Design an enzyme around this catalytic site. Structure first.
Site, PDB file in Angstrom:
ATOM      1  CG  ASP A 145      -1.827   1.219   1.219  1.00  0.00           C
ATOM      2  OD1 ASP A 145      -2.634   1.324   0.282  1.00  0.00           O
ATOM      3  OD2 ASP A 145      -1.739   2.052   2.143  1.00  0.00           O
ATOM      4  CD  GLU A 195      -2.114   2.361  -3.740  1.00  0.00           C
ATOM      5  OE1 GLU A 195      -1.787   2.213  -2.548  1.00  0.00           O
ATOM      6  OE2 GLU A 195      -3.124   3.001  -4.089  1.00  0.00           O
TER       7      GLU A 195
HETATM    8  C1  LIG Z   1      -5.008   7.625  -1.295  1.00  0.00           C
HETATM    9  C2  LIG Z   1      -3.867   7.478  -2.313  1.00  0.00           C
HETATM   10  O1  LIG Z   1      -3.090   8.705  -2.339  1.00  0.00           O
HETATM   11  C3  LIG Z   1      -1.974   8.730  -3.263  1.00  0.00           C
HETATM   12  O2  LIG Z   1      -2.450   8.758  -4.611  1.00  0.00           O
HETATM   13  C4  LIG Z   1      -2.360  10.031  -5.247  1.00  0.00           C
HETATM   14  C5  LIG Z   1      -1.216  10.007  -6.290  1.00  0.00           C
HETATM   15  O3  LIG Z   1       0.025   9.758  -5.656  1.00  0.00           O
HETATM   16  C6  LIG Z   1      -1.143  11.358  -7.022  1.00  0.00           C
HETATM   17  O4  LIG Z   1      -0.104  11.313  -7.990  1.00  0.00           O
HETATM   18  C7  LIG Z   1      -2.493  11.673  -7.713  1.00  0.00           C
HETATM   19  O5  LIG Z   1      -2.711  10.822  -8.827  1.00  0.00           O
HETATM   20  O6  LIG Z   1      -3.593  11.555  -6.762  1.00  0.00           O
HETATM   21  C8  LIG Z   1      -3.694  10.313  -6.014  1.00  0.00           C
HETATM   22  C9  LIG Z   1      -4.933  10.375  -5.067  1.00  0.00           C
HETATM   23  O7  LIG Z   1      -4.628  10.913  -3.790  1.00  0.00           O
HETATM   24  C10 LIG Z   1      -1.030   7.503  -3.071  1.00  0.00           C
HETATM   25  O8  LIG Z   1      -0.107   7.444  -4.148  1.00  0.00           O
HETATM   26  C11 LIG Z   1      -1.807   6.167  -2.985  1.00  0.00           C
HETATM   27  O9  LIG Z   1      -0.907   5.134  -2.614  1.00  0.00           O
HETATM   28  C12 LIG Z   1      -2.947   6.271  -1.942  1.00  0.00           C
HETATM   29  N1  LIG Z   1      -3.759   5.017  -1.932  1.00  0.00           N
HETATM   30  C13 LIG Z   1      -3.333   3.892  -1.039  1.00  0.00           C
HETATM   31  C14 LIG Z   1      -2.953   4.319   0.390  1.00  0.00           C
HETATM   32  C15 LIG Z   1      -3.857   4.914   1.234  1.00  0.00           C
HETATM   33  C16 LIG Z   1      -3.419   5.888   2.320  1.00  0.00           C
HETATM   34  O10 LIG Z   1      -3.523   5.499   3.673  1.00  0.00           O
HETATM   35  C17 LIG Z   1      -5.358   4.450   1.079  1.00  0.00           C
HETATM   36  O11 LIG Z   1      -6.185   5.606   1.150  1.00  0.00           O
HETATM   37  C18 LIG Z   1      -7.331   5.486   1.987  1.00  0.00           C
HETATM   38  O12 LIG Z   1      -6.955   5.643   3.377  1.00  0.00           O
HETATM   39  C19 LIG Z   1      -6.656   6.975   3.849  1.00  0.00           C
HETATM   40  C20 LIG Z   1      -6.281   6.886   5.348  1.00  0.00           C
HETATM   41  O13 LIG Z   1      -7.356   6.382   6.116  1.00  0.00           O
HETATM   42  C21 LIG Z   1      -7.885   7.894   3.611  1.00  0.00           C
HETATM   43  O14 LIG Z   1      -7.639   9.220   4.112  1.00  0.00           O
HETATM   44  C22 LIG Z   1      -8.529   9.564   5.192  1.00  0.00           C
HETATM   45  O15 LIG Z   1      -7.794   9.736   6.437  1.00  0.00           O
HETATM   46  C23 LIG Z   1      -6.929  10.904   6.528  1.00  0.00           C
HETATM   47  C24 LIG Z   1      -6.270  10.904   7.934  1.00  0.00           C
HETATM   48  O16 LIG Z   1      -5.415  12.018   8.121  1.00  0.00           O
HETATM   49  C25 LIG Z   1      -7.757  12.186   6.225  1.00  0.00           C
HETATM   50  O17 LIG Z   1      -6.908  13.331   6.276  1.00  0.00           O
HETATM   51  C26 LIG Z   1      -8.456  12.082   4.846  1.00  0.00           C
HETATM   52  O18 LIG Z   1      -9.258  13.226   4.643  1.00  0.00           O
HETATM   53  C27 LIG Z   1      -9.356  10.830   4.861  1.00  0.00           C
HETATM   54  O19 LIG Z   1     -10.037  10.657   3.621  1.00  0.00           O
HETATM   55  C28 LIG Z   1      -8.170   7.936   2.090  1.00  0.00           C
HETATM   56  O20 LIG Z   1      -9.306   8.761   1.835  1.00  0.00           O
HETATM   57  C29 LIG Z   1      -8.425   6.507   1.528  1.00  0.00           C
HETATM   58  O21 LIG Z   1      -8.451   6.555   0.105  1.00  0.00           O
HETATM   59  C30 LIG Z   1      -5.685   3.689  -0.254  1.00  0.00           C
HETATM   60  O22 LIG Z   1      -6.754   2.781  -0.051  1.00  0.00           O
HETATM   61  C31 LIG Z   1      -4.491   2.924  -0.875  1.00  0.00           C
HETATM   62  O23 LIG Z   1      -4.865   2.460  -2.142  1.00  0.00           O
END
Ligand SMILES: C[C@H]1O[C@H](O[C@H]2[C@H](O)[C@@H](O)[C@@H](O)O[C@@H]2CO)[C@H](O)[C@@H](O)[C@@H]1N[C@H]1C=C(CO)[C@@H](O[C@H]2O[C@H](CO)[C@@H](O[C@H]3O[C@H](CO)[C@@H](O)[C@H](O)[C@H]3O)[C@H](O)[C@H]2O)[C@H](O)[C@H]1O
Ligand SMILES: *[C@@H]1O[C@H](CO)[C@@H](O)[C@H](O)[C@H]1NC(C)=O
Ligand SMILES: [Ca+2]
Length: 496
Positions: free
Chosen positions: A197, A233
């Site tokens: 992740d 990811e």
């Molecule tokens: C979310 C995404 O951001 C980047 O992705 C960016 C990308 O790098 C950029 O280049 C552009 O394309 O936009 C993308 C969208 O953000 C990364 O590159 C990518 O790896 C990441 N996704 C992975 C990791 C997380 C994080 O913990 C998970 O998120 C998931 O869990 C997070 C933690 O609970 C959630 O935040 C949540 O908690 C936070 C706590 O401070 C809050 O501030 C936030 O408002 C709330 O929504 C998020 O909404 C959810 O989707 C998700 O399931 C998983 O797949």
């Protein structure tokens, strides 16, 4: 780390998003194993924060509190039990590893965790691991807010907080070890690999340093020397200092451009058409096939939380979705992952879905068991796309055509195309607004075949359309642009 470690003949994994361990166990035995599925992506098995506002959202599982196998999906025994039973029937388990961070810095200190572990985001104290202020990148991040502010700075993307999530100091050997300790416990239990992740937010080198600490797969189930399957990811579209290629030395990477472009092609956005899929793959600027983990939608982007946004096809677009998954499972590029979701009250306002946070079906926070309806569908709001005839059958189709080359391509210069996989399979699509009726070369052996989309072969007979292949491999197809499923697929094992 590039090989899935699925047993001979199984070519896909299914993401059973938010399922309980006990239900996955049963599913391995009663459907997945019998159906020829290679494995399952489980949601994070480690203790997370119990968020009540919103009420138990899905993303609360990406906010770790400790590495205890204790969550809404079940405890450590149930998890162990699940890996054992699934392995015994030849179905692998892949863990979603959340190792880039712990919980949000804004989260309140206390015992609001899925296992009751005490934690204090404010003081950086997670005694259950244990971790302290010395284990985070607070001092390393150079932004005014401490969060990631700009994505054109590869450093800050790695060293700062992803929307407030406490960033672990992965260069420290103590941290790398606590993480390897966690992963090795799982590998020795029997898991076959991991989904890493938020890998974009980790340094390729730091990841490699953690992988070097990992054991080989459990020798009771895997041949000696088996390395765990690793898929990173990494959301990489165009222009960004960070490229998914920087992660090839650690394993495979999620190719998000795949589902995005397939979604725009099938939706026919801005003039794209299926005839363009002729060179689908690297030719389209995608990562090499042996490093790609592909899918049409993921638990993230199916609810506008990842890459692709609006073009992404999901179960909500049933007709075009089936066709998309069909093309995916038929095309040779990458290793395929199938999505299996649950319904949530989609409520659009000014374009966005205000209920994209809704967690899995539950009763007072307790996740509902997956009930199986008499027709094989699922109850309790679980969509079970993997049980849909068209999808389940294309899963099997991939197994049968495995290894077969891409050949006999046909396109009308618009949206009706067809191609074959050696002499083991053939598929045709009609996405034009007018019926399709023609005779194509299938390179298939003469005989009568059951169309696996519209039906099933069932002991000497087809419950759906039937195709006849002549001696020269030719065969006639006819698809009305008004058909429930505007595509036909036949293979070596659907031949009468
Ligand atoms: C979310 C995404 O951001 C980047 O992705 C960016 C990308 O790098 C950029 O280049 C552009 O394309 O936009 C993308 C969208 O953000 C990364 O590159 C990518 O790896 C990441 N996704 C992975 C990791 C997380 C994080 O913990 C998970 O998120 C998931 O869990 C997070 C933690 O609970 C959630 O935040 C949540 O908690 C936070 C706590 O401070 C809050 O501030 C936030 O408002 C709330 O929504 C998020 O909404 C959810 O989707 C998700 O399931 C998983 O797949
Ligand atoms: C196929 O179905 C027909 C009835 O539609 C039946 O006469 C025939 O015997 C069946 N063949 C087999 C092999 O079961
Ligand atoms: Ca980081």
């Amino acid at each position: 780390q590039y090989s899935p470690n699925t047993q001979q003949g199984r070519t896909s994994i299914v993401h059973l998003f938010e399922w309980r361990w006990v239900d996955i166990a049963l599913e391995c035995e009663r459907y997945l194993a019998p159906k020829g599925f290679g494995g399952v992506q489980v949601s994070p098995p480690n203790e997370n924060v119990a968020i009540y506002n919103p009420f138990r959202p899905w993303w609360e599982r990406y906010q770790p509190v400790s590495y205890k196998l204790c969550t809404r999906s079940g405890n450590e025994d149930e998890f162990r039990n699940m890996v054992t039973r699934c392995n015994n029937v030849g179905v692998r388990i892949y863990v979603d590893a959340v190792i880039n961070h712990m919980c949000g810095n804004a989260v309140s200190a206390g015992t609001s965790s899925t296992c009751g572990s005490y934690f204090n985001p404010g003081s950086r104290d997670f005694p259950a691991v244990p971790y302290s202020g010395w284990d985070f990148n607070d001092g390393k991040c150079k932004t005014g807010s401490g969060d990631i502010e700009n994505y054109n700075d590869a450093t800050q993307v790695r060293d700062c907080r992803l929307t407030g999530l406490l960033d672990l100091a992965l260069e420290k050997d103590y941290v790398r070890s606590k993480i390897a300790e966690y992963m090795n416990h799982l590998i020795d239990i029997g898991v076959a690999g991991f989904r890493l992740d938020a890998s974009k937010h980790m340094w390729p080198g730091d990841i490699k340093a953690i992988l070097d600490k990992l054991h080989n797969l459990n020798s009771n189930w895997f041949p000696a020397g088996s390395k765990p399957f690793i898929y990173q990811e990494v959301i990489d579209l165009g222009g960004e200092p960070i490229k998914s290629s920087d992660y090839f030395g650690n394993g495979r990477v999620t190719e998000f451009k795949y589902g995005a472009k397939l979604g725009t092609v099938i939706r026919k956005w801005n003039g794209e058409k299926m005839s363009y899929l002729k060179n689908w793959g690297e030719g389209w600027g995608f990562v090499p096939s042996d490093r790609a983990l592909v899918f049409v939608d993921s638990h993230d982007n199916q609810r506008g939380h990842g890459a692709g946004g609006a073009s992404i096809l999901t179960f909500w677009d049933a007709r075009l979705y089936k066709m998309a998954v069909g093309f995916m499972l038929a095309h040779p590029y990458g290793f395929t992952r199938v999505m299996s979701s649950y319904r949530w009250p989609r409520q659009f306002q000014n374009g966005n879905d205000v209920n994209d946070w809704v967690g899995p079906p539950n009763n007072n926070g307790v996740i509902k068991e997956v009930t199986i309806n008499p027709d094989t569908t699922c109850g309790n709001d679980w969509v079970c796309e993997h049980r849909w005839r068209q999808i389940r059958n294309m899963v099997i189709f991939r197994n049968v055509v495995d290894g077969q080359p891409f050949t006999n391509w046909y396109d009308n210069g618009s949206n009706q195309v067809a191609f074959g996989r050696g002499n083991r399979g053939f598929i045709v699509f009609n996405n034009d607004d007018w019926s399709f009726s023609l005779t194509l070369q299938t390179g298939l052996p003469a005989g009568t075949y059951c169309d696996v989309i519209s039906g099933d072969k069932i002991n000497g007979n087809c419950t759906g359309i039937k195709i006849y292949v002549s001696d020269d491999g030719k065969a006639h197809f006819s698809i009305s642009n008004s058909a429930e499923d505007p595509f036909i697929a036949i293979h070596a094992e659907s031949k009468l």
